[PDB]
Design an enzyme around this catalytic site. Structure first.
Site, PDB file in Angstrom:
ATOM      1  N   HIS A 223      27.390  67.642  70.404  1.00  0.00           N
ATOM      2  CA  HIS A 223      28.000  67.635  71.285  1.00  0.00           C
ATOM      3  C   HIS A 223      29.059  68.761  70.251  1.00  0.00           C
ATOM      4  CE1 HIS A 223      26.983  64.511  73.573  1.00  0.00           C
ATOM      5  NE2 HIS A 223      27.255  65.678  74.885  1.00  0.00           N
TER       6      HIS A 223
ATOM      7  N   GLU B  28      37.349  65.736  69.686  1.00  0.00           N
ATOM      8  CA  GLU B  28      38.370  64.793  68.925  1.00  0.00           C
ATOM      9  C   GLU B  28      39.780  65.353  68.372  1.00  0.00           C
ATOM     10  OE1 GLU B  28      36.322  62.094  67.356  1.00  0.00           O
ATOM     11  OE2 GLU B  28      35.527  61.105  69.355  1.00  0.00           O
TER      12      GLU B  28
ATOM     13  N   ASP C  23      28.077  50.349  66.384  1.00  0.00           N
ATOM     14  CA  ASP C  23      28.528  51.625  67.629  1.00  0.00           C
ATOM     15  C   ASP C  23      27.524  51.514  68.728  1.00  0.00           C
ATOM     16  OD1 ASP C  23      30.100  54.774  67.971  1.00  0.00           O
ATOM     17  OD2 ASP C  23      30.061  52.164  69.515  1.00  0.00           O
TER      18      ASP C  23
ATOM     19  N   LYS D 207      34.914  49.433  71.102  1.00  0.00           N
ATOM     20  CA  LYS D 207      34.811  50.398  72.297  1.00  0.00           C
ATOM     21  C   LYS D 207      35.283  49.324  73.738  1.00  0.00           C
ATOM     22  CE  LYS D 207      33.006  54.231  70.878  1.00  0.00           C
ATOM     23  NZ  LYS D 207      31.787  55.011  70.241  1.00  0.00           N
TER      24      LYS D 207
ATOM     25  N   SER E 156      37.825  51.807  68.596  1.00  0.00           N
ATOM     26  CA  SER E 156      37.504  53.313  68.814  1.00  0.00           C
ATOM     27  C   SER E 156      38.163  53.710  70.116  1.00  0.00           C
ATOM     28  CB  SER E 156      36.524  53.417  68.297  1.00  0.00           C
ATOM     29  OG  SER E 156      35.962  54.311  68.145  1.00  0.00           O
ATOM     30  N   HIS E 157      38.557  54.724  69.695  1.00  0.00           N
ATOM     31  CA  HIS E 157      38.623  55.157  71.212  1.00  0.00           C
ATOM     32  C   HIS E 157      37.118  55.789  71.777  1.00  0.00           C
ATOM     33  CE1 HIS E 157      38.329  59.546  68.718  1.00  0.00           C
ATOM     34  NE2 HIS E 157      37.858  58.743  67.823  1.00  0.00           N
ATOM     35  N   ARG E 158      37.446  56.880  73.014  1.00  0.00           N
ATOM     36  CA  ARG E 158      35.668  57.599  72.945  1.00  0.00           C
ATOM     37  C   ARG E 158      36.192  59.021  72.947  1.00  0.00           C
ATOM     38  NH1 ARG E 158      31.492  54.270  75.042  1.00  0.00           N
ATOM     39  NH2 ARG E 158      30.711  55.828  73.566  1.00  0.00           N
ATOM     40  N   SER E 159      35.068  59.875  72.498  1.00  0.00           N
ATOM     41  CA  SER E 159      36.096  60.784  72.618  1.00  0.00           C
ATOM     42  C   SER E 159      36.146  61.885  73.411  1.00  0.00           C
ATOM     43  CB  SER E 159      33.987  61.703  71.961  1.00  0.00           C
ATOM     44  OG  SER E 159      33.001  61.892  72.988  1.00  0.00           O
TER      45      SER E 159
HETATM   46 MG   LIG Z   1      28.731  57.692  70.733  1.00  0.00          MG
HETATM   47 MG   LIG Z   2      29.823  56.288  66.563  1.00  0.00          MG
END
Ligand SMILES: [Mg+2]
Ligand SMILES: [Mg+2]
Ligand SMILES: O=C(O)[C@@H](CO)OP(=O)(O)O
Ligand SMILES: [Mg+2]
Ligand SMILES: [Mg+2]
Lengths: 432, 433
Positions: free
Chosen positions: A157, A209, A317, A342, A369-372
């Site tokens: 991205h 991020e 992940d 997540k 963890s967050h998400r983007s």
């Molecule tokens: Mg990912």
């Molecule tokens: Mg990852």
């Protein structure tokens, strides 16, 4: 019991729709919102979007909102279950949806309620959210995590050629959580200048991020810039590096494409063994202590081979998708030694806590963890403390959907007073 | 009365320290945080920073925080006043500081407490914050603002040559505030594809307020990109453009430098007249309906001359600094016809309300504004609704220090139900609705 549940569409940190839930009890209003990923693994629970190409380019979540307002809300209100019964309420939603991957309502519909229930439960227990989560998890100690700050954004991205997704700094040597925040901010600002000096001001804008997005290809050059910034900030002995390769994003026909944002060319592909070799060179040459998603989500052989040949943290992940079934397989195969947690990969608080406890029972680390695609929600700060996992990644110290969580971690550390402990060098295995 | 106050340092959206205040009453905990400018006018109230080079490169706010915890907090607890008494409480702080520009405690110390008191005030009244603010301001009839989304960032907010600071889109033709969010987000995503196709993916990273930071120099090219995205998204009849030039940032030896982030070359500088001619071209070629800070904060003749020669909105920001003394001068000189309202340019809720009322009494518009260093705080969403100003700029629809405000304005519209009214094409003058 629950008095009212009401969902709506809000915008996340990239400007796309997501689900927010307001839940009311006699104690008041409890609000939660759901994040959204971009490099999403194929095994993640379903994020339900509208697909109306005319409205938000197909990305609305009216359908998920309506499942909450029209179906979930009246069912949970009618059950009379107290919001302390996290597991009963989450299991009721799972059975209402009736599917394994939450494809009837969306994991986004179920999780926005699950999170709002958990907050309302904390208030019914007369506890701060992190303490309620500790009791749900069977935890007694609480521990502040080392933060992992993504400072050079790359990947699928990212507005550059850089293949690997994230280059993180971890202030393992800091004195406390608030001190770790200072170390991370100072290195981040120092890195902005290192970049400006080498690549020019054009290279100093930020990605999703909050990390910098310089016009580079070579993953060793990202590592060199990060190491140069840590040195120039004066923190060589206290900050180490973690990576999120997100290799599922650049797997192609059985091999891996480290120039995949360019126009297709198979001659440039390398094998997983070649890729493993590159990582061993990074671990030798740079202070890399943790590598997440080094291979594709289905390339079990490369994960187990690599994990057996290194001493660093190897984080599942996309391989694990916060999913106890995939986690059991990765434990059997010795594929990795840390779970990325997540909540929206699996779709309920109860299942994410179960995933975390499974990983920890088998000796793995857990990094929350967050998400983007994030929101102003701060649930995950209380979650990492209540689960005592010792490590969180939730952005660069830039863009307030990332700072909202880091500032909440600083408030939690302040609130704990003399009882606050910081995981520091024990970020992998804080239970000691 | 106030039970306890506790301030701390948090990090803003650029990773710099700023003040947050927790205030406690019988109704619970009320929290607020203070924003911080980059392109800050010379006449803004003092933002007190620690200057300790060993800590956040001198940007800590431990001094402001201690002035709150050790001096302002017992002062307000001793007063015994209810938190509904915004004006008495703010005046107690202004007198205790006792300086014109709040240089004893810092405007950031006084504002953090001022905002927390206001939030606690609304709870004591059993009102939503926007209703409490309307009562403070003497307004009865609330209106949702048109949002002004800064979708291409330049100047001091971005890594590019582009000198003008902000290129905004305003969905004046939306049906509601929720619909204006959808229009703004659709144009912003469309614009990403327009920039990527023309300049490459490397041109689509963002600046400090979440606008794209393309590698361009010409301000006319930023306007062209924005107009292209408006058209491609299908909203040409419903979305217009605003600009914040922030010309004080590029005022150099009596002239203006439109390439001020490239190594100094005075041969490129242009005059005030030349800059005014360029704005006339923009207003003729593009649907520009509002220009903010077209000239330097002390170049009063150029502001008056330009204002008299256009029929658009001209917004004072560094010119006026949310400050009644400077606003009176701008009214007297007809320098501009709208006020940018920034609580932390003046340092208290009461003074910002007074600045807003003074502008509106003079027939000016008022556009409530964020700072480019924001936090997860949402006060200014309730403030623009309570003050009925009709217009807010608080970021691109990108970075949640921006979306937290936009999302809160959606919640406020939903809460108002059939009473909700959207300013639309009356963003300059919503009292007529
Ligand atoms: Mg990912
Ligand atoms: Mg990852
Ligand atoms: O000049 C401005 O209008 C503001 C807000 O966009 O920027 P800063 O906070 O950096 O002054
Ligand atoms: Mg400014
Ligand atoms: Mg301005």
């Amino acid at each position: 019991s629950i008095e009212k549940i009401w969902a709506r569409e809000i915008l996340d940190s990239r400007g796309n729709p997501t689900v927010e839930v307001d839940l009311y009890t006699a104690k008041g209003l409890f609000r939660a919102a759901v994040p959204s990923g971009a490099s999403t693994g194929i095994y993640e629970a379903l994020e339900l979007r509208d697909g109306d190409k005319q409205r938000y380019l197909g990305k609305g979540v009216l359908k998920a909102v309506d499942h909450i307002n029209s179906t979930i809300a009246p069912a949970l209100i009618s059950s009379g279950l107290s919001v302390v019964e996290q597991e009963k309420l989450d299991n009721l939603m799972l059975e209402l949806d009736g599917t394994e991957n939450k494809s009837k309502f969306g994991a986004n519909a179920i999780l926005g309620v699950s999170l709002a229930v958990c907050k309302a439960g904390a208030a019914e227990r007369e506890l701060p959210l992190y303490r309620h989560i500790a009791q749900l998890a069977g935890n007694s100690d609480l521990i502040l995590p080392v933060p992992a700050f993504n400072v050079i954004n790359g990947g699928s991205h990212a507005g550059n050629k850089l293949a690997m997704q994230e280059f993180m700094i971890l202030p393992v040597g800091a004195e406390s959580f608030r001190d770790a925040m200072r170390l991370g901010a100072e290195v981040y600002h120092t890195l902005k200048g290192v970049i400006k000096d080498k690549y020019g001001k054009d290279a100093t804008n930020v990605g999703d991020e909050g990390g910098f997005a310089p016009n580079i290809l070579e993953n060793s050059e990202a590592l060199e810039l990060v190491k140069e910034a840590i040195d120039k900030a004066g923190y060589t002995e206290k900050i180490v590096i973690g990576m999120d390769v997100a290799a599922s994003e650049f797997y192609r026909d059985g091999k891996y494409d480290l120039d995949f944002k360019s126009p297709t060319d198979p001659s440039r592909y390398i094998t997983g063994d070649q890729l493993g070799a590159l990582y061993q060179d990074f671990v030798r040459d740079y202070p890399v202590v943790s590598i997440e998603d080094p291979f594709d989500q289905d390339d079990w052989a490369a994960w187990s081979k690599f994990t057996a040949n290194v001493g660093i943290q190897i984080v599942g992940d996309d391989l694990t998708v916060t999913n106890p079934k995939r986690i059991e397989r990765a434990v059997e195969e010795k594929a990795c030694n840390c779970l990325l947690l997540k909540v929206n990969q699996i779709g309920s608080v109860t299942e994410a806590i179960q995933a975390c406890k499974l990983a920890q029972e088998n000796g793995w680390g857990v990094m929350v963890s967050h998400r983007s695609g994030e929101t102003e929600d701060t649930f995950i700060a209380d979650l990492v403390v209540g689960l005592c996992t010792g490590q969180i990644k939730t952005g660069a110290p830039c863009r307030s959907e990332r700072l909202a969580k880091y500032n909440q971690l600083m408030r939690i550390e302040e609130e704990l007073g003399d009882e606050a402990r910081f995981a520091g060098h024990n970020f992998r295995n804080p239970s000691v």
